[PDB]
Design an enzyme around this catalytic site. Sequence first.
Site, short mmCIF file in Angstrom:
data_model
loop_
_atom_site.label_atom_id
_atom_site.label_comp_id
_atom_site.label_asym_id
_atom_site.label_seq_id
_atom_site.Cartn_x
_atom_site.Cartn_y
_atom_site.Cartn_z
N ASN A 46 5.04 1.45 1.92
CA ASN A 46 3.84 2.23 1.41
C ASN A 46 4.32 3.60 0.98
O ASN A 46 5.29 4.12 1.40
CB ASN A 46 2.69 2.30 2.43
CG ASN A 46 2.34 0.95 3.01
OD1 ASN A 46 2.19 0.74 4.25
ND2 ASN A 46 2.06 0.07 2.17
N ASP A 48 3.20 6.48 1.71
CA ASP A 48 3.33 7.41 2.86
C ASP A 48 4.53 7.24 3.75
O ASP A 48 4.68 7.98 4.72
CB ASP A 48 1.98 7.41 3.59
CG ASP A 48 1.71 6.19 4.43
OD1 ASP A 48 2.55 5.26 4.41
OD2 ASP A 48 0.74 6.17 5.26
N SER A 50 5.05 4.50 5.64
CA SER A 50 4.78 3.36 6.53
C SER A 50 5.19 2.04 5.78
O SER A 50 5.51 2.10 4.60
CB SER A 50 3.31 3.35 6.97
OG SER A 50 2.49 3.10 5.85
N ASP A 52 4.02 -2.24 5.62
CA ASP A 52 3.16 -3.38 5.93
C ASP A 52 3.93 -4.60 6.29
O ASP A 52 4.95 -4.90 5.60
CB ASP A 52 2.29 -3.74 4.73
CG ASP A 52 1.32 -2.65 4.34
OD1 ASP A 52 0.86 -1.88 5.18
OD2 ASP A 52 0.77 -2.77 3.22
N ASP A 101 -12.38 -2.02 14.08
CA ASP A 101 -12.15 -0.55 14.07
C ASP A 101 -13.23 0.26 13.37
O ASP A 101 -13.26 1.47 13.45
CB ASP A 101 -10.83 -0.22 13.37
CG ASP A 101 -10.47 1.26 13.37
OD1 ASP A 101 -10.28 1.82 14.46
OD2 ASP A 101 -10.37 1.86 12.26
C1 LIG Z 1 2.27 -6.89 -2.75
N1 LIG Z 1 1.97 -6.71 -1.29
C2 LIG Z 1 2.31 -5.32 -0.98
C3 LIG Z 1 0.59 -6.99 -0.76
C4 LIG Z 1 -0.41 -6.06 -1.48
N2 LIG Z 1 -1.47 -5.72 -0.53
C5 LIG Z 1 -0.89 -5.14 0.64
C6 LIG Z 1 -2.53 -4.78 -0.99
#
Ligand SMILES: CN(C)CCN(C)C
EC number: 3.2.1.17
Length: 129
Positions: A46, A48, A50, A52, A101
């Site tokens: 990401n 920032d 981070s 995923d 959340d």
């Molecule tokens: C392409 N990968 C990063 C998934 C896209 N999502 C996280 C929004």
Amino acid sequence: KVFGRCELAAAMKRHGLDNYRGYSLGNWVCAAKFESNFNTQATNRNTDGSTDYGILQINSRWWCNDGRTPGSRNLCNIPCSALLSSDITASVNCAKKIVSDGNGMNAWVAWRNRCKGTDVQAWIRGCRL
Ligand SMILES: CN(C)CCN(C)C
Ligand SMILES: CN(C)CCN(C)C
Ligand SMILES: CN(C)CCN(C)C
Ligand SMILES: CN(C)CCN(C)C
Ligand SMILES: [Cl-]
Ligand SMILES: [Cl-]
Ligand SMILES: [Cl-]
Ligand code: NA
């Protein structure tokens, strides 16, 4: 592991996602398709700093520990690599915390932009569940 569509719907059902916080199964399958293409090993950095992780692309800013996201939290109390397993347990249990959340499945921008408001039941059509 790259899941099949119905294979992942079955696993998610077993793990208690169908209608979890009122999101029918297809919502979860749709989210997984667009986040990771059903690939448990997917990782994406990401802006920032981070990352995923996994089938539901759960971020290290809040949810898991990857040791390289300064200032972040680990609210699922798991290493981010646990989200890459062929076994979706940890991704599911963390998704349950996430979707509770406050913003529901809007926490996944991909869900909001690609699944919300569409015929999500298509994603489980045909499957033996
Ligand atoms: C392409 N990968 C990063 C998934 C896209 N999502 C996280 C929004
Ligand atoms: C894979 N993600 C990132 C985008 C959509 N796929 C499912 C074709
Ligand atoms: C919404 N549709 C195109 C997705 C379900 N297919 C892949 C069986
Ligand atoms: C497996 N075939 C017999 C269907 C039964 N459940 C899974 C819907
Ligand atoms: Cl559905
Ligand atoms: Cl960290
Ligand atoms: Cl909600
Ligand atoms: Na973290």
